Amino acid sequence: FRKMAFPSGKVEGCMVQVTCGTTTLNGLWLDDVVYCPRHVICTSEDILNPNYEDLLIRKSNHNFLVQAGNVQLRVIGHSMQNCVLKLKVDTANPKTPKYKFVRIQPGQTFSVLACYNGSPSGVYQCAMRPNFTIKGSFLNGSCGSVGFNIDYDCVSFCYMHHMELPTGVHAGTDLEGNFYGPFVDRQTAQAAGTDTTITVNVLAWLYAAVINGDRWFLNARTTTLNDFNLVAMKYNYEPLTQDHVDILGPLSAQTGIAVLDMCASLKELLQNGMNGRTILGSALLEDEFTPFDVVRQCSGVV
Amino acid sequence: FRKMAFPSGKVEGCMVQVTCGTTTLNGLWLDDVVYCPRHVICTSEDILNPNYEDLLIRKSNHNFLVQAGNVQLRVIGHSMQNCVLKLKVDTANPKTPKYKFVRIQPGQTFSVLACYNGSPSGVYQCAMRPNFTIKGSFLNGSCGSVGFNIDYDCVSFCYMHHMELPTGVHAGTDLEGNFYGPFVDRQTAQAAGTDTTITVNVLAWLYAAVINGDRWFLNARTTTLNDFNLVAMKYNYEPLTQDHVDILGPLSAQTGIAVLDMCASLKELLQNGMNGRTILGSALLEDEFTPFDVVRQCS
Numbered sequence: 244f245r246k247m248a249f250p251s252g253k254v255e256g257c258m259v260q261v262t263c264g265t266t267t268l269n270g271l272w273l274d275d276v277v278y279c280p281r282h283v284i285c286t287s288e289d290i291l292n293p294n295y296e297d298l299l300i301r302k303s304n305h306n307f308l309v310q311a312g313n314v315q316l317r318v319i320g321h322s323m324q325n326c327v328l329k330l331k332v333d334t335a336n337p338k339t340p341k342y343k344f345v346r347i348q349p350g351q352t353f354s355v356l357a358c359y360n361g362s363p364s365g366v367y368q369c370a371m372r373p374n375f376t377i378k379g380s381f382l383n384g385s386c387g388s389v390g391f392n393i394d395y396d397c398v399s400f401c402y403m404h405h406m407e408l409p410t411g412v413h414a415g416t417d418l419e420g421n422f423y424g425p426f427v428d429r430q431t432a433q434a435a436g437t438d439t440t441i442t443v444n445v446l447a448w449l450y451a452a453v454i455n456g457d458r459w460f461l462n463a464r465t466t467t468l469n470d471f472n473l474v475a476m477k478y479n480y481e482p483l484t485q486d487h488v489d490i491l492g493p494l495s496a497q498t499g500i501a502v503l504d505m506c507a508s509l510k511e512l513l514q515n516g517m518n519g520r521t522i523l524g525s526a527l528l529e530d531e532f533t534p535f536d537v538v539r540q541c542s543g544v545v
Numbered sequence: 546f547r548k549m550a551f552p553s554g555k556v557e558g559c560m561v562q563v564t565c566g567t568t569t570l571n572g573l574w575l576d577d578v579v580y581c582p583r584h585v586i587c588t589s590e591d592i593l594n595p596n597y598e599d600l601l602i603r604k605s606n607h608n609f610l611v612q613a614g615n616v617q618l619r620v621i622g623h624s625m626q627n628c629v630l631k632l633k634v635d636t637a638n639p640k641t642p643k644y645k646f647v648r649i650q651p652g653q654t655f656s657v658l659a660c661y662n663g664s665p666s667g668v669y670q671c672a673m674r675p676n677f678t679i680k681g682s683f684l685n686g687s688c689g690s691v692g693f694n695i696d697y698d699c700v701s702f703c704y705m706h707h708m709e710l711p712t713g714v715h716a717g718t719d720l721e722g723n724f725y726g727p728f729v730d731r732q733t734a735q736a737a738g739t740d741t742t743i744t745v746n747v748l749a750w751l752y753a754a755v756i757n758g759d760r761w762f763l764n765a766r767t768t769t770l771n772d773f774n775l776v777a778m779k780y781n782y783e784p785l786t787q788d789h790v791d792i793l794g795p796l797s798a799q800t801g802i803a804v805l806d807m808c809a810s811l812k813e814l815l816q817n818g819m820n821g822r823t824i825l826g827s828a829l830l831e832d833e834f835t836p837f838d839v840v841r842q843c844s
């Protein structure tokens with residue numbers, strides 16, 4: 244069972260580069276607006292202690308270089324929404340897909356189209372960690388790369404890359420500019436909080452194993468959600484939500500294994516280990532496949 | 546450090562649906578030609594034991610229905626190159642990228658755009674195993690999905706998917722229709738040769754694990770190339786060539802760990818196991834990152 248990004252063509256046609264001063268990063272061109280991180284307007288020295296409201300007053304439309312490839316798009320208006328700069332341009336992107344801006348939950352996955360200078364470099368699948376970082380693969384100049392999900396040719400944009408933290412994980416915003424987690428767009432000592440394992444995803448992976456005939460771990464017990472949540476937290480596992488129980492519905496229905504029965508199976512694995520057995524060929528419990536990722540991998544979606 | 550696929554947009558614009566009789570799969574539309582697996586001309590019975598030249602001569606242009614999204618393309622010619630059917634259509638694909646057909650060597654990596662009924666489903670990075678299978682993620686209806694690399698906007702197509710073997714691994718051809726491996730497009734049970742591990746890729750990935758701040762596997766020993774290759778063969782690893790040592794140069798220069806030093810680390814990992822520890826998040830020695838893949842993603 245391997246990770247699988249969404250096809251990225253619909254997002255590739257929306258990638259541009261945004262330059263202000265000497266700073267160049269990536270932007271997302273949808274209809275007649277270009278979205279990018281607001282720290283583009285900072286100098287290498289401003290970023291240490293910025294005042295974004297007053298830095299933006301000093302800027303004009305003619306201070307922003309937006310390019311689709313080498314083709315300039317004239318900026319006809321600018322504004323700041325949270326941590327995102329919105330540059331109105333004079334051309335509506337004819338490649339604009341049907342799209343939505345969504346804010347995702349910790350544990351959810353998305354594809355990231357890594358870009359440099361507005362040029363798509365690669366695509367890979369990421370999970371939002373419970374500490375609101377992603378273990379992405381970004382180099383300098385990757386800021387403004389976006390993460391997304393596709394559902395029947397509507398692109399749901401959920402992530403915009405802003406920075407790398409000291410431990411090498413990445414932080415960013417949704418497309419309305421609101422950071423995921425307690426991070427701010429200033430170059431100061433910031434630390435990701437302690438991470439936990441995404442329980443709903445581990446369960447999805449156990450269902451994937453059952454679907455493929457590996458079911459040695461199914462046991463004979465059950466548990467309540469509240470009791471499972473209290474035990475899981477003792478192993479640094481995330482508690483389950485009512486929404487988590489519901490998105491596990493299809494896999495539970497497909498296998499005939501009740502969600503709370505699978506919780507008791509997981510609890511036994513946490514309490515006693517795997518005893519040198521494997522699951523889907525792993526001795527480690529994998530937590531970066533959502534229930535939709537498992538469904539998607541076994542359905543010929545689009 | 547993640548497995549990273551090429552952006553699939555240039556290939557997405559080339560995927561179409563090919564239907565012959567009751568069989569439907571994906572085709573690759575470039576210019577005025579549509580390439581697809583030739584077993585689309587087989588019925589459920591033909592596939593059990595086909596004589597393809599005999600089956601093809603009996604087909605007409607109107608037997609093949611090609612759909613690009615909603616438009617139907619008119620087939621105006623058909624021929625066969627090894628296991629690949631080539632349908633000439635009456636319209637050029639305006640989205641044809643600069644492209645080349647290439648045959649990749651075992652151990653090389655490529656991106657796969659998995660498709661169903663001519664519509665893209667997902668993209669992921671794959672490696673040609675030394676036994677010429679690939680460990681892909683394909684389901685029914687994925688035949689005709691292609692593998693590719695992209696270099697400065699030129700798409701090098703290297704694989705077309707044909708079937709899943711009973712072990713769950715996958716087999717297919719280059720775009721000239723020649724299978725990778727000793728397989729045939731007849732629905733009969735087919736085993737592959739015993740697989741081996743791509744040593745140069747494992748070494749590249751350990752270098753990536755050092756670039757990313759993880760050194761627990763390193764040790765002080767060093768080894769000769771031949772002495773490493775003896776242990777490598779013992780554990781069913783592919784030989785390491787002097788070309789491989791040179792390919793790993795940039796990675797050894799970057800980290801200040803000589804290649805034969807990293808080989809001694811890997812040999813200790815092979816003999817002692819990993820003791821329950823992990824490298825770059827994995828519990829097993831990963832072998833589907835080439836040195837180029839590491840260099841690109843780490844620089």
Ligand SMILES: O=C(Cn1nnc2ccccc21)N(Cc1cccc(Cl)c1)c1ccc(-c2cnc[nH]2)cc1
Pocket residue numbers: 568584585586587588589592683684685686687688707708709710729730731732733735
């Ligand atoms: O495995 C596949 C196709 N496939 N590919 N990925 C897959 C993933 C999951 C399941 C199936 C998959 N096979 C079986 C096969 C095995 C070895 C050799 C051959 Cl030739 C076929 C197949 C291919 C063509 C036809 C066909 C029928 N009528 C015209 N064509 C019918 C069956």
